[PDB]
Each structure stands twice: as structure tokens, then as C-alpha cells.
Nucleic acid binder design. Structure first.
Lengths: 498, 314
DNA sequence: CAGAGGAATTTCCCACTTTCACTTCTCCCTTTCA
DNA sequence: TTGAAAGGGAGAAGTGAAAGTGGGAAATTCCTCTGT
């Protein structure tokens, strides 16, 4: 024989209950239940009527139908599931006391262990697939009946699954309901602004869905137009026929994109003729595309690479255009008053911060990658970036370590107690000036990604200046002698002192 | 005829600061000063007058009732430990600043043990006498030394005060009590001046203390006749304690007020109010007169910033 | 006298912002070279 | 009628990591109406 569900449990509308609420917390209503008439989950056992048993347990909504962590509670419920004796003279069975008790996330592992610990595993899902996040907002009832083969031995028949049951209290699975509308009428051209009061919705997964005699439209609003999850202010979409001679009654309803869920419709008839959130990545792409920031432009037709002007802000010729995108970000986020439509020229004190906020925000976003740091070539200082995944082709202690190594010629020790070391130091303007002469200098540039033997013109004075600048005002290290001027053997001598 | 004392220069801002449970992580911004604004921030400040070279000031959270008591919430951040902030100051400067001050929101079940532990520290330590705890042996000051053997009988007193106070405890409002100290002959900070208490600080997350704000509305105009329906969007309010008031300052210290018409059922999920407009001062008028609208909490008369509303003739 | 549903209390964590701890640059001269 | 670069010193700028910020919303717990 075989089990058949005759009355499915209502899918939306009932919230799960926490042990803490306990008390008398109703039971799972049946598919066809109304405010005036409640029905209950019901199965029919085709091809058998007699002694037997029925276990109803909870399982995952999706394919690897693992034992769900929540548990059934009510008459004849123990260890998380339901089990009772069948009525020998009825082949239709009703369950009117099924309650779903949801377990807390903190206690999820123990709950799952209890499920394995009690053999409540209908499809004997191997402990492997039995792991991975669980959707605690949805469950499916699993009916496991056991009749008896022609006189004698017991007989378990295929388990059957019910439609899933969603937690009405959980925000992303609750039942959608429009509660009050501003105006239920408007122009066939659309564009009339409407205020809709609703039940909890998620501003990032919800839409106002219009329909009717073979037609579909959607009101327009940014997430910023959804107020504290219970109010949406949008604009009416254009009607199919932009030339009415009479009004037309259409349907208006809330729609949850992710799963197609819909709410009861609200009449709306057409008649005859809030600042959006600035997300950094989306904002940046828009600004580069605008063509309004000299220097901020795409470097290809696919629009996967782009340059950002990056002149050092210590430069005295630093212009407005040089810092325009950095300032634009400050203004969009309200950290700097806009223009006309006071202000204080203390605007140049602000720019270093504007640059760092822009650099840091860009980095947090994780949506970009740096291809080339051309904030060097004096002519055009800028950086080049590529969007994540599309053509990602990136292209005192240190000295202490270096002292022992003394690899390259020119450097070594004079003090066999570690502290008095000799570094070369020939003046770059010497005809005899060698490339490997600034070898110790070259090591620092390479060892900081500052220099790459392949993709970087060599800059000897900078390598020397940066190596020197690092040491200088570094309390815990200083100079000794200074045969730098020495025409024959140029070189200095340093030492430490914590 | 005076002596050295502590003066609160800048008080901490009263509304809009969010208290934080420990599960929310440390630091979410420090309590603002009453003068602090948009992109120009400030903080609560104290000034030791009639100077005394070096000095160490401390801050504690006291309740807001008639009887200034020890609160169960705690101060955290910069220079804090056990809900007490301790900062040094006074070499030359006598004005101390308090940035990075956060208010740890203690849990309900948690308040009794926290209060008992917090008061016990007080009976034993030599900070503030039997004032914030209970009218009793208020000795054990910063006079001789710092520490006292908690008698068996004394312990019962702390427990009783803790039980009574936990019931009185209001977790939505708190106050700061500044206590300064001047050096000892030994250089130690034991010379205690008078304690000063700050303005009450309300938890912005408390519905009843929430800072009111009109976020958006249907229309900003109507006929002086009134009776027109409006759809207003606002920050969290309580259905039984909210009203929409219209008003215009009149000639010669005058002020006309009008109230939106609605029932608490009209308050939607604490975030919206659908109501009808009140009738203007006088029906038949010359031309469009503009007034102001504002949410106002009944229980405390607190209000939201005004928003312009234009009345026009029929 | 439940028990459906509105709130209040607590917990998470998004999406940047600022700071930490150093390292580099432009400025503005000086020196050095040839 | 001090030429072309390299060198130095100060100190503001620049940096990636790692905290700090400010909010909105999700998870949990309570508790009041509905209508005994």
C-alpha cells in the first residue's frame, strides 16, 4: 500500500515557538484552514486498514532530507518526533496536536546529536551530508507508516514528505501582508507616489508587483525607500495602455523575489492621461563612468580596468581636479558640505584624510585589485585597478637580518659583537658609479615591493634616500663615522643602542 | 572663603547615545558632549578650579533617582576598570577631557549580582562613603588607608540594599558622577574634593527615551478646514504615548497649537502614523499661512525637530 | 484562560572609518660632479 | 654673470592591518489583548 497526504499543513502564517514560550502554543493548521474553520494535517493509507504505527518527524526542506534540528511537540511527542498507534478501523488519519518547537542557534549541535542519538533519521542520510548549515526557518513533515504484510510481520512503507512549513515570525520567510495604502488610484502614465504600510519586509528582497489581464509591472523604489521594514514609498509603474478613455482596475501586491511569495492583492485603478544609499563599489563604478573626473577613466571596452588619479598631496601645485574624486566621496558620505545651490578654504587640510578614506574604503570593499601603482612617473601620477576576478594579473629588523647575511660586496663587519657595521656610500655623480654599487640600497627597494627587476625603471637616488630616511629619526640607532666624502673608499658606519 | 573644587565645563549630551551590551563588542563610539555636533565633535569636560598641581579624577555611573545611587551599567573604554574611569591631570592643565567613554548595558538577570559586586567594592574601598550604598557606617574613607574588613553583619546590609535597589534600578537612564583627588604629602592622590553629578543620560535605544524624528510625510500642506488624511513616517514611538502637534508662534509671546487626529491603532508597527489634520486657527483666511509639525511624547513632552506645514484657504 | 500576535530585550554583523605603527615624499636648500 | 644632479633634514603624507564606528536588523524572550 502507500501513504498519501490529503490535507497538507498550511505553509505560511504560523510562527515556530521557542521552549521559553512553552505554554499552549497552538498546532500546525491544515492547508485549507480559515479564520473561521481550522483543518489539520491528514494522511490516507491506500491499500490497508488495520493495526499499525505512524511516526511523523521533521526533516530539512531541501534534497539531502536530513533530520531537522527543531522538534515536534504535543500529544504523543517524545525525543523530538511524533509516534502513535493507528486506528484499526479507519484508513484516514488526522493529527491535530502537532507543534513545532524551534531550537536556539547556541544549542544547535546538541539538538542534531540528539537526532542521531535516537535514530530519528528517516532517509538514513549518512553522517557526512548530515552536516552543513540548516535552514531554521523551514521544515518538512516526514510521515513514516508501518502496516502489516498479509498476516504476520510488520511492514514499513515509503516515507512521504509534506509541503514545507515556514516560520512566520522569522523576517525572511514571514507571510506578506499589505496593511494600508496612501492612494489606490493614479495616472496611466504611472509615476504617482504611493505610501504602502506593510508587515515586516526585507528592503533588499521585496517589490510592489502590479498585474491584471495579461500584464506585469513593478513600482520603483530604492532600498532607502523602505522605512524600518514596515513602510514602502514608491512610484506607480506605467500602465500597458498609455492612453485611457476610462479607468482600469488592476492588482497591486507585495512580492518577495527570492521565492516568489505573494500577498493578498489590493485594488488599484489607473485613470486617463529619499536619498539612496551610496555603496562604495557601485558608487565608484558610476563615477568612473560619468566621465566627470579628469583622470578617472576606464582603460578598456569591457570596463574591467580603470585609473584613479593619485598625485602626492604634499605637492604645492596640487589642484582641485587632482583631488576631485576623493572629495566627492567625502561629500557623498556627508563629511563635507557641498557647493552653492562659507565654505572654508580649510579644504586642503582635509584632503589627506579624503585620500585615505577613499583608499581604505576601496580596500575594505574587496571588489578591486591593483594592477599598477603609477603614482610614480611625475608626469601622470595615478593607480590602475582591475575588478575582482576577470583578469587578475597583479603586475630596523630587516637590516639586522641583513647584517648577518652580508651577501653583496661592500658590506660586512668590523665589529665582531654585532652593532658596528660598514655600509657603502659612493656619491651617485661619480663616473665610476656602479649599478651594483648601490646593491645594499637595491635590496631594500626590492624587499618592500618598491622595486621589481623586471617591471620598474631603476631609481638610484630614491633607493638611497629611502634607505637613509628609514634609519634616520628612528631612536634606537644612529651613525658612527662617515667616509662618505672619502674620494677613495666611500662608506659610512652605523650602530644600535636601545 | 572657598577652596579647591570640581566644575563640569561641558556636560554629556542627554539624548541619542546608544548603550551597549557586552556582546556587541567594545567601542561603538564614546558618549558625546552636549555641545558636540555633526562633523565637529566634543566630549564631557571637568575643570579643577583653585588648582592643585597634579590630580586624579574618576567617573562613576550613578542612578537618576531622588537618592543618588550606584548604577548597574558600567563605563568602559579609554581609562576604565570595573565601570570606573580613572584619569590623571593637573600638571599645568586643569581641564580634563573625556572622549572614548562608553556605557555598558548590563543585562537584566545580571543587574543584581553586578550591583552587589559594585557596591561591595565601595564599602570595602575608599572612594565614595556610605552615600551611594546605604545610610550606615560611611567611614572607611581615603583618610587612613584603602581597604576594610567586611564584617559578617555588613554583608547582609549590602545584599538587602542590592535587592531593593535592583527593583528601583532603571536601565534606560544613567548619570555621571565626577570625583577629583589631590596629591598626598607622599605624592598619593587621597585629598578628596566634592563630588559633582552630571545631567541624566538616556539610552537612545529605549523606546521611551528614543529621540523623536519625523522621517517623511504624505503631504506638507492642507486646507485650514482640516480633516485631511496624512501618512507620516517616523523613528520608533509607542502607540499609547505619541501625538502630532501643529503650531505657530503668534504675535507678542503667543502660540497656537493643533493636534493631529488619530487612534493608537493608527500607529503602525511603531514606525508610522496615519492621521487627519487639525483645523487651522481661523477658517476663512487671506492667503497660505505656514506652521510647524512635530511628534511629541505625552509622558515627558519631549519633541522632534519641527517640520514646515503649509495651510491654505478653502 | 488559551494563544495569536505586538513588543521588548539581546545578539549579530554590515560596511565602512580611524588609528596604529611605520615608511615615504615634496620642499627647500646644500654638496658634489664634470 | 650659481649649471645639473645627487644629498640631507623636517615633517606632512602615505600605507595596510587592525581596531573602532554607527546603524539596521535578526534572534529570543515577554507579555497583552482577544475576547473567556
Amino acid at each position: 500500500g502507500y501513504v498519501e497526504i490529503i490535507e497538507q499543513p498550511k505553509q505560511r502564517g504560523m510562527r515556530f515557538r521557542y521552549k521559553c514560550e512553552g505554554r499552549s502554543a497552538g498546532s500546525i493548521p491544515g492547508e485549507r484552514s480559515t479564520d473561521t474553520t481550522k483543518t489539520h494535517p491528514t494522511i490516507k493509507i491506500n491499500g490497508y486498514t488495520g493495526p499499525g504505527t505512524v511516526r511523523i518527524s521533521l526533516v530539512t526542506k531541501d534534497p539531502p532530507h536530513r533530520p531537522h534540528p527543531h522538534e515536534l511537540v504535543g500529544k504523543d511527542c517524545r525525543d523530538g518526533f511524533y509516534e502513535a498507534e493507528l486506528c484499526p478501523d479507519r484508513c484516514i488519519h488526522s493529527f491535530q496536536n502537532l507543534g513545532i518547537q524551534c531550537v536556539k542557534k547556541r544549542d544547535l549541535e546538541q539538538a542534531i546529536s540528539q537526532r542521531i542519538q535516537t535514530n530519528n533519521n528517516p532517509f538514513q542520510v549518512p553522517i557526512e551530508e548530515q552536516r552543513g548549515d540548516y535552514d531554521l526557518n523551514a521544515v518538512r513533515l516526514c510521515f513514516q507508516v508501518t502496516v502489516r504484510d498479509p498476516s504476520g510481520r510488520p511492514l514499513r512503507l515509503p516515507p512521504v514528505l509534506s509541503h514545507p512549513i515556514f516560520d512566520n515570525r522569522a523576517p525572511n520567510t514571514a507571510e506578506l501582508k499589505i496593511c494600508r495604502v496612501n492612494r489606490n488610484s493614479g495616472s496611466c502614465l504611472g509615476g504617482d507616489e504611493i505610501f504602502l504600510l506593510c508587515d515586516k519586509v526585507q528592503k533588499e528582497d521585496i517589490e510592489v508587483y502590479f498585474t491584471g489581464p495579461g500584464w506585469e509591472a513593478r513600482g520603483s523604489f530604492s532600498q532607502a525607500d523602505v522605512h524600518r521594514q514596515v513602510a514602502i514609498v514608491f512610484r506607480t509603474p506605467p500602465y500597458a495602455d498609455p492612453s485611457l478613455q476610462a479607468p482600469v482596475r488592476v492588482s497591486m501586491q507585495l512580492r518577495r523575489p527570492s521565492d516568489r511569495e505573494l500577498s493578498e492583492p489590493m485594488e488599484f485603478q489607473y485613470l486617463p492621461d529619499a536619498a539612496p544609499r551610496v555603496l562604495f563599489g557601485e558608487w565608484l563604478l558610476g563615477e568612473i563612468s560619468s566621465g566627470c573626473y579628469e583622470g578617472l577613466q576606464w582603460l578598456d571596452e569591457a570596463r574591467t580596468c580603470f585609473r584613479v588619479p593619485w598625485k602626492h598631496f604634499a605637492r604645492k601645485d596640487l589642484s582641485e581636479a587632482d583631488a576631485r574624486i576623493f572629495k566627492a566621496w567625502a561629500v557623498a558620505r556627508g563629511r563635507w558640505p557641498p557647493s552653492s545651490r562659507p565654505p572654508p578654504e580649510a579644504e586642503t587640510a582635509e584632503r589627506a584624510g579624503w585620500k585615505t578614506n577613499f583608499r581604505c574604503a576601496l580596500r575594505s570593499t574587496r571588489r578591486f585589485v591593483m594592477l599598477r601603482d603609477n603614482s610614480g612617473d611625475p608626469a601622470d601620477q595615478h593607480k590602475v585597478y582591475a575588478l575582482s576576478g576577470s583578469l587578475s594579473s597583479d603586475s630596523l629588523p630587516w637590516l639586522v637580518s641583513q647584517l648577518d647575511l652580508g651577501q653583496l660586496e661592500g658590506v660586512a663587519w668590523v665589529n665582531k659583537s654585532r652593532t658596528r657595521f660598514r655600509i657603502p656610500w659612493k656619491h651617485g655623480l661619480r663616473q665610476d658609479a656602479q649599478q651594483e654599487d648601490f646593491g645594499i640600497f637595491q635590496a631594500w627597494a626590492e624587499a618592500t615591493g618598491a622595486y621589481v627587476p623586471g617591471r620598474d625603471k631603476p631609481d638610484l637616488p630614491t633607493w638611497k634616500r629611502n634607505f637613509r630616511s628609514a634609519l634616520n629619526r628612528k631612536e634606537g640607532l644612529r651613525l658612527a663615522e662617515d667616509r662618505s666624502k672619502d674620494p677613495h673608499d666611500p662608506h659610512k658606519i652605523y650602530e644600535f643602542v636601545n | 572663603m572657598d577652596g579647591p573644587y570640581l566644575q563640569i565645563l561641558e556636560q554629556p549630551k542627554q539624548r541619542g547615545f546608544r548603550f551597549r551590551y557586552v556582546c556587541e563588542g567594545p567601542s561603538h563610539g564614546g558618549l558625546p558632549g552636549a555641545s558636540s555636533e555633526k562633523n565637529k565633535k566634543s566630549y564631557p569636560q571637568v575643570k579643577i578650579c583653585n588648582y592643585v598641581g597634579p590630580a586624579k579624577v574618576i567617573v562613576q555611573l550613578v542612578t537618576n533617582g531622588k537618592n543618588i545611587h550606584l548604577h548597574a551599567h558600567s563605563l568602559v573604554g579609554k581609562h576604565c576598570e570595573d565601570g570606573i574611569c580613572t584619569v590623571t591631570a593637573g600638571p599645568k592643565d586643569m581641564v580634563v577631557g573625556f572622549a572614548n567613554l562608553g556605557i555598558l548595558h548590563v543585562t537584566k538577570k545580571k543587574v543584581f549580582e553586578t550591583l552587589e559586586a559594585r557596591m561591595t567594592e565601595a564599602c570595602i574601598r575608599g572612594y565614595n562613603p556610605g552615600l551611594l550604598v546605604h545610610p550606615d557606617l560611611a567611614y572607611l574613607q581615603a583618610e587612613g588607608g584603602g581597604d576594610r574588613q567586611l564584617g559578617d553583619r555588613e554583608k547582609e546590609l549590602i545584599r538587602q540594599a542590592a535587592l531593593q535597589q535592583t527593583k528601583e534600578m532603571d536601565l534606560s537612564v544613567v548619570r555621571l558622577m565626577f570625583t577629583a583627588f589631590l596629591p598626598d604629602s607622599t605624592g598619593s592622590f587621597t585629598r578628596r574634593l566634592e563630588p559633582v553629578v552630571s545631567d541624566a543620560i538616556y539610552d537612545s535605544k529605549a523606546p521611551n527615551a528614543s529621540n523623536l524624528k519625523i522621517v517623511r510625510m504624505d503631504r506638507t500642506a492642507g486646507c485650514v478646514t482640516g480633516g485631511e488624511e496624512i501618512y507620516l513616517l517616523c523613528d520608533k514611538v509607542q502607540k499609547d504615548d505619541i501625538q502630532i502637534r501643529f503650531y505657530e508662534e503668534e504675535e507678542n509671546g503667543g502660540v497656537w497649537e493643533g493636534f493631529g487626529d488619530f487612534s493608537p491603532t493608527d500607529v503602525h508597527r511603531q514606525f508610522a502614523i496615519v492621521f487627519k489634520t487639525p483645523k487651522y486657527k481661523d477658517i476663512n483666511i487671506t492667503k497660505p499661512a505656514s506652521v510647524f509639525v512635530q511628534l511629541r511624547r505625552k509622558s515627558d513632552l519631549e519633541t522632534s525637530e519641527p517640520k514646515p506645514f503649509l495651510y491654505y484657504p478653502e
